[PDB]
Design a protein around this ligand. Structure first.
Ligand SMILES: [Cl-]
Length: 311
């Protein structure tokens, strides 16, 4: 999907939010409507969009709306990390939004945002944490693509009736852009372990125009003009933190390595207390260093000294 098609959908989706019927007797039969749900349940993958769009132009799905919302919520949260599948999901959600506006999109958005609430427990398995982070990144990607086409815009679109996650509740006065709110939450779960730094790098790589002031290509797609500024502030703070932690870890791993090496010269032993602690810290250091380098390259900044010769 090119920027032209994004803008086409944005215009249609904005009109739908504005109360227009922009989507052009309907079939209200049980067979037709359950047949639609079954099609949704096969998942949002490439090509599946066109068939579903035909149903939206032929079927009267109003009495199955609640079920469609739940079904789509599950499908959306489980979209694969495949660029073509994401595009299909965007076209399908846009169609549904154009047919039903807020009575579909409001509860969908509220339920979808639950995907960004941080766990309220500690990490038990870093293997599981990597899987969790992968899921969050996929959910963030899909959210952002739907933001850019004007489907998912702001908490202000959600009805009071429709629940929103705890981390987004009780907002008064000036609200931050929704993407800022989401990223401030997800970047800050167990930050010191370094797994969330990969959310930051994945996000800037895929959505670069949000981070480059000279890049105006998505300005017409952005809901609140403060977004680019807010995101730049958030990420520059995150970079300061990432650089600082990388430097702290760099000093620790080098110190432990040096003591281990001196020990091995003295005694000939392969193992000692220094390399045992080193082994626990090194993967964390590597996560921070890799991310420090990527963030530095993207924002054209020099990295702190992070030399380390390992293995
Ligand atoms: Cl915004």
């Amino acid at each position: 999907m090119d920027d032209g098609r994004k803008k086409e959908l944005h215009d249609l989706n904005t009109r739908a939010w504005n109360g227009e019927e922009v989507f052009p007797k309907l079939d209200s039969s049980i067979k037709r409507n359950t047949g639609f749900i079954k099609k949704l349940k096969k998942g949002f993958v490439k090509g599946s969009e066109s068939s579903l769009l035909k149903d939206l132009s032929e079927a009267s799905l109003e009495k199955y709306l609640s079920e469609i919302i739940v079904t789509v919520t599950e499908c959306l949260l489980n979209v694969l990390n495949k660029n073509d599948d994401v595009i299909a999901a965007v076209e399908i959600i846009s169609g549904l939004h154009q047919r039903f506006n807020g009575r579909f999109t409001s509860p969908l958005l509220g339920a979808f945002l639950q995907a960004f609430e941080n766990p309220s427990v500690d990490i038990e398995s870093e293997r599981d944490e990597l899987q969790r982070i992968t899921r969050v990144k996929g959910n963030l990607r899909v959210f952002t693509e739907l933001y850019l086409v004007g489907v998912f815009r702001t908490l202000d679109d959600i009805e009071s009736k429709d629940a929103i996650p705890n981390f987004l509740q009780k907002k008064t006065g000036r609200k931050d852009p929704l993407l800022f709110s989401i990223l401030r939450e997800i970047l800050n779960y167990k930050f010191k372990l370094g797994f969330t730094t990969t959310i930051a790098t994945a996000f800037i790589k895929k959505f670069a125009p949000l981070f480059r002031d000279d890049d105006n290509s998505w300005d017409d797609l952005i809901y609140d003009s403060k977004l680019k500024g807010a995101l730049q502030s958030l990420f520059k703070n995150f970079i300061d933190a990432t650089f600082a932690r990388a430097t702290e870890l760099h000093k620790k791993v080098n110190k432990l390595q040096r003591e281990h090496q001196k020990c091995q010269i003295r005694t000939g032993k392969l193992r000692d207390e220094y390399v045992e602690e080193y082994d626990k810290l090194l993967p964390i250091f590597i996560r921070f260093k890799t991310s420090a380098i990527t963030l530095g390259e993207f924002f054209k900044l020099e990295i702190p000294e992070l030399h380390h010769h390992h293995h």
